[PDB]
Amino acid sequence: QVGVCYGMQGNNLPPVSEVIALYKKSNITRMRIYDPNQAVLEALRGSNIELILGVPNSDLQSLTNPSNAKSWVQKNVRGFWSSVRFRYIAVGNEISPVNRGTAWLAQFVLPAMRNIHDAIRSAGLQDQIKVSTAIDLTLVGNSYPPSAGAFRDDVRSYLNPIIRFLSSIRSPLLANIYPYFTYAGNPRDISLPYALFTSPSVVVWDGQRGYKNLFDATLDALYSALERASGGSLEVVVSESGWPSAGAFAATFDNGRTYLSNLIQHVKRGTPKRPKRAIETYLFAMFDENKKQPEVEKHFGLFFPNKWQKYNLNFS
Ligand SMILES: *[C@@H]1O[C@H](CO)[C@@H](O)[C@H](O[C@@H]2O[C@@H](C)[C@@H](O)[C@@H](O)[C@@H]2O)[C@H]1NC(C)=O
Numbered sequence: 484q485v486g487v488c489y490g491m492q493g494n495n496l497p498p499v500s501e502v503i504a505l506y507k508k509s510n511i512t513r514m515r516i517y518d519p520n521q522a523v524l525e526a527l528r529g530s531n532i533e534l535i536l537g538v539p540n541s542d543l544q545s546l547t548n549p550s551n552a553k554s555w556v557q558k559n560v561r562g563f564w565s566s567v568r569f570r571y572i573a574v575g576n577e578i579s580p581v582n583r584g585t586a587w588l589a590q591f592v593l594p595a596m597r598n599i600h601d602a603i604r605s606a607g608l609q610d611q612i613k614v615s616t617a618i619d620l621t622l623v624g625n626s627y628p629p630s631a632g633a634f635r636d637d638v639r640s641y642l643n644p645i646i647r648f649l650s651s652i653r654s655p656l657l658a659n660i661y662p663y664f665t666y667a668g669n670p671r672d673i674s675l676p677y678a679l680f681t682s683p684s685v686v687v688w689d690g691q692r693g694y695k696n697l698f699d700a701t702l703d704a705l706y707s708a709l710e711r712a713s714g715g716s717l718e719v720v721v722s723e724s725g726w727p728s729a730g731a732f733a734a735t736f737d738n739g740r741t742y743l744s745n746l747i748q749h750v751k752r753g754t755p756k757r758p759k760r761a762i763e764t765y766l767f768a769m770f771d772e773n774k775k776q777p778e779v780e781k782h783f784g785l786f787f788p789n790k791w792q793k794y795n796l797n798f799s
Pocket residue numbers: 484510512798799
């Protein structure tokens with residue numbers, strides 16, 4: 484089953500308690516949060532909703548201290564494990580050692596991951612709670628054709644031991660993946676149906692592999708890059724994917740409804756490189772978030788604030 488990201492950065496959202504109810508009501512069995520919000524954590528008790536618990540980028544430095552990590556795991560994980568189904572801990576989100584926004588944080592990521600995993604393991608929860616980190620694909624330097632997928636050379640020192648770490652504890656890699664932003668940036672070379680899963684014929688030939696949609700192309704490029712960096716047995720969890728209903732080029736209700744309905748159907752199976760297994764996917768995001776910048780970042784909601792679905796999606 485597909486999951487949905489619960490961002491809370493709006494001034495008009497239902498109270499936490501109602502959002503959980505609305506998850507249960509809609510039969511959404513997986514949730515991703517971006518910080519260990521106590522109210523949300525308390526509201527998920529007995530919910531049977533599988534959780535991605537996020538470590539905020541702002542707390543990464545602090546958690547490179549083992550004792551600090553131990554207490555974080557105690558307060559935000561062990562304090563709720565009776566009643567909250569932790570599935571992954573996302574230590575950091577979209578960190579890159581070469582992007583201006585997060586470069587000064589790259590140092591902190593693996594140590595935080597190690598301390599958190601150690602604490603989790605000390606509590607004996609390591610076969611239940613998988614420690615990982617959530618990337619964006621700015622780290623992928625080349626992705627066309629997908630078989631040529633490779634990480635940017637200037638991030639290998641960062642990525643290599645993290646890949647290695649994930650292998651030793653059998654964690655997946657978490658990836659935020661948005662065919663929308665790719666398309667919006669280059670509508671000249673990328674066709675809308677390709678981005679929307681509506682292409683009847685193959686669009687890209689990669690030897691014996693036919694790519695019908697941008698998502699498959701993009702994911703498989705990631706897999707190829709992992710393979711070149713000795714992470715060829717890692718599973719990828721798609722930890723965000725969404726299409727905005729307004730606010731910018733190609734951000735439309737119709738595009739939105741198509742992408743998300745087709746995505747939900749697509750991920751029951753895999754990609755041309757890994758065709759069998761379902762792709763675990765977290766849709767971004769539950770509600771529009773009117774406090775975010777820029778404009779387009781206010782329209783990824785699946786639901787209006789009156790709790791009515793934009794698109795009438797079946798999550799079962
Ligand atoms: C919520 O989603 C899951 C899939 O992730 C469905 O299996 C649920 O259906 C219920 O559980 C299955 C095992 C079967 O018993 C079916 O009869 C149930 O409806 C789904 N829940 C609902 C209420 O649709």
